[PDB]
A paper describes a structure:
Parasite-infected red blood cells sequester in the placenta through interaction between parasite-expressed protein VAR2CSA and the glycosaminoglycan chondroitin sulfate A (CS) abundantly present in the intervillous space. Here, we report cryo-EM structures of the VAR2CSA ectodomain at up to 3.1 Å resolution revealing an overall V-shaped architecture and a complex domain organization. Compared to other PfEMP1s, the ~310 kDa VAR2CSA ectodomain is relatively conserved among parasites. Several of the DBL domains are linked by complex inter-domain (ID1-3) regions with limited or no homology among PfEMP1s yielding a DBL1-ID1-DBL2-ID2-DBL3-DBL4-ID3-DBL5-ID4-DBL6 structure.
Likewise, the C-terminal DBL5 and DBL6 are more separated from the core, linking the protein to the membrane in a physiological setting. Flexibility of these domains is further supported by two separately generated maps based on different subsets of particles, showing the same core structure, but different conformations of DBL5/DBL6. By contrast, DBL1 and DBL5/6 were less well resolved compared to the apo structure. The simulations also suggested significant flexibility of DBL1 and DBL5/6, consistent with the relatively poor EM density in these regions.
Residue numbers in the entry: 1988 to 2624
The structure:
Amino acid sequence: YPLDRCFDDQTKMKVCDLIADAIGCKDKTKLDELDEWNDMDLRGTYNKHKGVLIPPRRRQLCFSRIVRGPANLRSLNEFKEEILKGAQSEGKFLGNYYKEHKDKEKALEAMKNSFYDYEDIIKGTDMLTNIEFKDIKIKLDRLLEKETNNTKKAEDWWKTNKKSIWNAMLCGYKKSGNKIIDPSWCTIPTTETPPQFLRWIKEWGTNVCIQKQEHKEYVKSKCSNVTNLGAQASESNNCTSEIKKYQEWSRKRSIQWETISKRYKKYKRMDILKDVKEPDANTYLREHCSKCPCGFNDMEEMNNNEDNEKEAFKQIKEQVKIPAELEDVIYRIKHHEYDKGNDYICNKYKNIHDRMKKNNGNFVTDNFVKKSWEISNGVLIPPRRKNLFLYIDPSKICEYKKDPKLFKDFIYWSAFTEVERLKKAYGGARAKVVHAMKYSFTDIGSIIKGDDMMEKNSSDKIGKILGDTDGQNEKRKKWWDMNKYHIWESMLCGYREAEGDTETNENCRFPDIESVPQFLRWFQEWSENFCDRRQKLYDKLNSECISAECTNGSVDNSKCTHACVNYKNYILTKKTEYEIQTNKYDNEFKNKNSNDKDAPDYLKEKCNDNKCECLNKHIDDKNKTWKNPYETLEDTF
């Protein structure tokens, strides 16, 4: 009762106690956030804009000004503050559900949205046919203004005329008899007033994003941990269809926010800020509230496109894997890429890049493209990865690691700079650059998890950070994903610089090779860097002499003589490596995840470019090996 109790209590503030409730409020709380805000707010909605979604606006504008009489009972009107009487409390008056939901932030957000809605109405920004919205607002303002002065109507009237604003939420129900001692909760950022454009777009953003947060809540709570052995106990399959229903109504909102992209049509009244930059609505929502993303984009996948989709007939059916796909985190935009590059988030992401880190330590151009293979442990790590640009030093240590966000940004910067490094290394070669991004991304993943054979020093450094002080890398693993999406889109954005707008449809949108073991990835890339080198060799000097393998040691001309020399040295190196990777595989990566196949079969099936899957001339690379040319390399228990 008399406790600390934000100043409302300890004020001798019996004034609000003497203040009663408005004659309005025919409801204090009806059904909250759900499918009601669609178009049922106005008729002839085309006026002044297209018909749009609304907050709990028509659901709470308690109407004590029934008469709309003269400004004689309306000197300070005693209702535009009285209607708000009732607040964060035992749990009613616009937020009733939070007491059952056990979250004060729900009531606080309801208060803030309704409050700024009243600010809008006082200034006048509504697109809905409401009597108070009509002249009565400015009529009362002008009538109160009738003293041959004060033509600052909105600025002076904005609460009444005297006390700044917002004094009406305090002393709610039971004088707001349920609270939290922190004044930051007890008073909102009243001082800052987002503009009316920002207010209506934030109306939209909240009214959709908070609902989609609760939609994620339905997705996680029910329709998941079910239909997977099992529930409840009949089948619980139809729960899946329920999200299909959610999507449906949400998808309407989809096209609706497209109008929000236009909003006049005039794409924006104002520009880049904490929640708004609006190249599109999805960018706003990503830039939007702390208790965001979008969403949860823009799923389940109808559109939200260009491709990819699932998505037909509908579904296949064969059953839909949205259960398996989305029951687990993913909780956010992965769906992506699609974007494909038609965006703004990339360039502002570059605005993040080379800033907060000004290339204060940056290496490129070692020309590892034209180099050979090296053991470095007796293990033959790729020259692709040998100088992979990422390394930390003192001032980036366990004591330094109290800024995981900044460290994450540094990792993104490293990946982006790596993208430019590959650009310079190939001198620009888009097809090669895409696979460059593939192995670089997946090897950065290996490092950040920490399994690399050649890495022995910065692996310990990243072990110092991110915890995991034992041999286990659990926290590093649970970091790597989910950071996979952000790192990969970072590298894709880096790649887009030369293309501008050209989707890497040739590649898997997210590199699937992330799943497979790291050593297998190195073998795959060295196979990819193999027998494309061979084709270049045939182009160089086998083109003129002659057509194929010569029928002796080698001679038709001195040039392709040297071509055969390079060939046999290259094959010698390949046989040594192929041997070491084969024994490594059959020993310690064979038949885990039940890969019943020899390493060359893995080479065949994982390859898709068809440059690999060699199949050499004077064949040494194939699905098998000579000396009993059947296959090998099987293991079991």
